[PDB]
């Protein structure tokens, strides 16, 4: 199915709320665009149900964007890469 999902969070603060209970074994990269923070989760070493599973949790604070990942990869604006959720907890929780 899919092992990479593209999530939009309404503003950063939503991602923070989320980050603090999902960071995954999924390298993940977080952009800011339109002042809203997008989170691109890229599941590495997961199965499709396992991703739908996890992806539920993520989407307790987010929704699933229809925006193609290659649009991000070209014209995006990075804030934290690789372990974006992990980093957002650092750079936001307190």
């Amino acid at each position: 199915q899919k092992l990479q999902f593209v999530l939009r969070f309404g503003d950063f603060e939503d991602v923070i709320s989320l980050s603090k209970l999902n960071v995954n074994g999924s390298k993940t990269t977080l952009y800011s665009f339109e002042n809203r923070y997008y989170l691109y989760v890229d599941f590495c070493n997961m199965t499709d149900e396992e991703v739908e599973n996890q992806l539920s949790i993520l989407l307790e604070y987010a929704t699933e964007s229809s925006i193609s990942i290659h649009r991000l990869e070209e014209y995006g604006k990075l804030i934290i890469s690789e372990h974006a959720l992990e980093t957002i907890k650092k750079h936001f929780a307190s």
Binding site: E13, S17, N35, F92, A93
Partner: protein, 79 residues
């Protein structure tokens, strides 16, 4: 009645300044210098919204007035 929030119109103004600080801080990083800015932002934001319906107390206080004087003001108001 609802000429502001409770006069807590200033709150929204604050929340603006936060978002900015937050936003711009996170765009540069200012990692933990963004941290506290997020927390201050969405904390504030929700607080605003809590007190934006605190002049729903001003709704339960005020929100039916269609009285003599009220009407009368209108009757003079239009002409």
């Amino acid at each position: 009645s609802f000429t502001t929030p409770p006069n807590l119109k200033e709150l929204e103004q604050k929340l603006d300044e936060v978002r900015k600080e937050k936003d711009a801080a996170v765009q540069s990083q200012e990692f933990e210098k963004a941290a506290s800015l997020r927390d201050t932002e969405q904390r504030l934001r929700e607080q605003v919204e809590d007190t934006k319906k605190s002049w729903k107390e001003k709704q339960g206080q005020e929100n039916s007035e269609v009285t003599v004087d009220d009407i009368a003001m209108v009757v003079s108001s239009w002409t």
